[PDB]
Paper text:
We also determined the structures of complexes of DtHNL with 4-hydroxy benzaldehyde, benzoic acid and (R)-mandelonitrile/benzaldehyde using soaking techniques. Clear electron density was observed for those ligands bound in the canonical binding cleft of the Bet v1 fold. In all three structures, the aromatic moiety of the different ligands is bound in a hydrophobic pocket formed by the side chains of Val44, Val48, Trp47, Val51, Val52, Phe71, Cys73, Ile108, Phe111, Trp138, Leu160 and Ala164. Especially the valine residues at positions 44, 48, 51 and 52 together with Phe71 and Leu160 seem to be important to shape the cavity. A part of the phenyl ring is also pointing towards the solvent, therefore, larger substrate may be bound in a way that substituents are located in the active site access tunnel. The polar parts of the ligands (the OH-, carbonyl- or carboxyl-group) are hydrogen bonded to Tyr101 and Tyr117. In the other complexes, a water molecule occupies this position.
Residue numbers in the entry:
A (entry chain A): 9 to 183
B (entry chain B): 9 to 184
Amino acid sequence: EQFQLRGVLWGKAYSWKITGTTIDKVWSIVGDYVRVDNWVSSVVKSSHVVSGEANQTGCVRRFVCYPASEGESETVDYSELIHMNAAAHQYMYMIVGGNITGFSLMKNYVSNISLSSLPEEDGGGVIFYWSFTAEPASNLTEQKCIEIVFPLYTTALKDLCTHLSIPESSVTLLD
Amino acid sequence: EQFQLRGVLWGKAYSWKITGTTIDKVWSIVGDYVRVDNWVSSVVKSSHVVSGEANQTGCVRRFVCYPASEGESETVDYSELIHMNAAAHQYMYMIVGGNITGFSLMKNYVSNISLSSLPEEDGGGVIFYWSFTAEPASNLTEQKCIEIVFPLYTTALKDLCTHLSIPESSVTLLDD
């Protein structure tokens, strides 16, 4: 009959409907965690595992991003896979280092990806769930985090279509 | 060029499609965080806010569960709301105290609830996303965690239908 208060979190969750594809096809790109360069290829130049075994829980990926603008340097993201369930097409990760533009500003950025199949009889398709949280800190606001994260998710959904060779119209942001 | 290794997590995410209702009817039940007794009524006897403002982030609810099986006693759950975006139909909470059966065994049980609408153009309907994580601990297993959580979520979706006055056939667990 007692309890201990914890800190509150910032963040937001997004869901897209994707037609003209299957959970396996989406996963073949999105599920290769340590080769994110083969997914968000418009932002990410290269990626490889630097700790643990590729795509296994606890592993760390290091990926390199193209310069944010001309003159600026490439930036780096280290992120740990903190939960992986490939059979259930879902995983969870956190940035544990690097100077990746914007994302490296957040405190304990944690992200969740979940894929689901819509019923066969409803025309199939995939529900792509993608959320993040970050801890409140004085150099940011929740609104500023959203302005960092959401545009990237949007780009990644576009880059997904490119790699799937399906039109961008295949993707609809729910709500 | 350095990073900081951390521990891994246990958990699982589930999604259901719910027909025959609207996202705002579902939210009126599911979104009323401190009155979970009006939702999972097969399990929860009573509930109220005990810290902060009702359903505002940071608040804590205390709720009483019926005996889990015959002979046992009522148990109690203290859970804190740690994120809330009502207009976006999504929130996050964590158990911060109590002896609630099964759930209080987990270390740092964190849960996420997210509602979305399917396109009007393609039938409508609500996608109900519900996930949890817990921190691995010597006294438990992830499989045990899933045995604790999933039947509760399952029961909760059935109770939701009761309170919405829609057939339980309205709910379908999505393949993952």
